[PDB]
């Protein structure tokens, strides 16, 4: 929801075209009193409480909460036997059929999320194999998230990713309250 | 709109067994969008309900209402198609089993009134439907006799139970 921006918008009675004049006088016509032909009661009139402009749904959980969510997702995969650690993502071939058959043989889920340390160093074989697959998705470590970990039945991590995730998530524990954004230089923070 | 009356002529029954009473022929015909009030047409339809084709034609030939001529034309067309397409042996061996009028698609016009005011006139149209069944017209329902009334009353008396007890 934090990225969500709904673009639904309706016109109010002020924004619907026309509708300035009073349709008929208050008294005498035997008809109901109306002030414009564009009030919400009218066909073609405004919307009383419709969606209003592009609305954002942005909010930030505490970064400690978000890191804890990542940790909980990892523990859940491990405890439910959906987490598999690899020495590397190197494949004998870039053929997607090999990857699908390997998952089927090893009884992985219908969907696999393979995570490598950085985008650049990902093996070309696994890159080619996963670029053509829909349920086998390959992401860098910096792209790991609870939603994708839950969408994919199995999570495959390399050892460098495991070390990287341990460092990053454990840093949230035992860290000070920030003095300024961590993007700024700190004594001990890369 | 609906056009089920037209389709009712296209139903084909399975062939009858030799030891089965001959199924009387049934012919459905209609005229759609007659410039006439359905309320006025209803009286002519009701009039010719249940009558033989010849009796209905005779009654309609001497009726002053505009719809009488239209109903007569519809009945003549139904007789013709009964003989040609529905294997009815005798033209006159037909009776009006059903004759009804229905609302047609109507047009709205403005009727000017006296003080810059107006009404919405409706240019009324009506449909007319007939089912013709081959055979003599069924006899009219005989009036209730005193014997039949007394029998019904005594049956009601005998139907009595001791209510709200064991």
């Amino acid at each position: 929801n934090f990225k969500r921006i709904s673009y639904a918008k309706t016109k109010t009675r002020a924004e619907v075209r026309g509708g300035g004049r009073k349709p008929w006088p208050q008294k005498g016509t035997g008809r109901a009193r109306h002030g414009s032909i564009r009030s919400p009661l009218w066909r073609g009139g405004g919307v009383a409480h419709g969606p209003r402009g592009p609305t954002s749904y942005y909010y930030m959980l505490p970064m400690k909460v978000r890191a804890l969510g990542l940790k909980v997702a990892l523990t859940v995969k491990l405890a439910q036997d959906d987490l598999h650690i690899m020495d590397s993502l190197e494949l004998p071939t870039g053929d997607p059929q090999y990857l699908t058959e390997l998952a089927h043989y090893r009884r992985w889920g219908d969907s696999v999320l393979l995570v490598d340390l950085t985008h650049e160093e990902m093996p070309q074989s696994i890159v080619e194999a996963t670029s053509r697959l829909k349920t086998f998705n390959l992401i860098p470590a910096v792209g790991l998230n609870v939603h994708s970990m839950l969408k994919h039945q199995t999570l495959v991590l390399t050892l460098p990713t495991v070390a990287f995730l341990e460092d990053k998530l454990l840093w949230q524990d035992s860290r000070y309250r920030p003095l300024y954004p961590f993007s700024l230089p700190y004594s001990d923070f890369p | 709109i609906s056009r089920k009356w037209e389709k009712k002529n296209k139903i084909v029954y399975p062939p009858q067994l030799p030891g089965e009473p001959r199924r009387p022929a049934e012919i459905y015909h209609c005229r759609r969008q007659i410039k006439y009030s359905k309320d006025k047409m209803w009286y002519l339809a009701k009039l010719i309900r249940g009558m033989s084709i010849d009796q209905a034609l005779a009654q309609l030939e001497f009726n002053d209402k505009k719809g009488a001529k239209i109903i007569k034309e519809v009945l003549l067309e139904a007789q013709d198609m009964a003989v040609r397409d529905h294997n009815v042996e005798f033209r006159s061996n037909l009776y009006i089993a059903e004759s009804t009028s229905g609302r047609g698609q109507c047009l709205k016009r403005i009727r000017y009134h006296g003080r810059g005011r107006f009404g919405i006139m409706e240019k009324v149209y009506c449909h007319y439907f007939v089912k013709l069944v081959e055979g003599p017209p069924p006899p009219p329902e005989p009036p209730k006799t005193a014997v039949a009334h007394a029998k019904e009353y005594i049956q009601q008396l005998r139907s009595r139970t001791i209510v709200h007890t064991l």
Binding site: P25, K27 | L107, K108, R109, I110, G116, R117, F118, I120
Partner: peptide, 16 residues
């Protein structure tokens, strides 16, 4: 006095 209100002509000029 309240003047009469005329409805639009198209409502009553419709044809099949």
């Amino acid at each position: 006095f309240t003047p009469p209100i005329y409805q639009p002509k198209f409502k009553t000029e419709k044809e099949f």
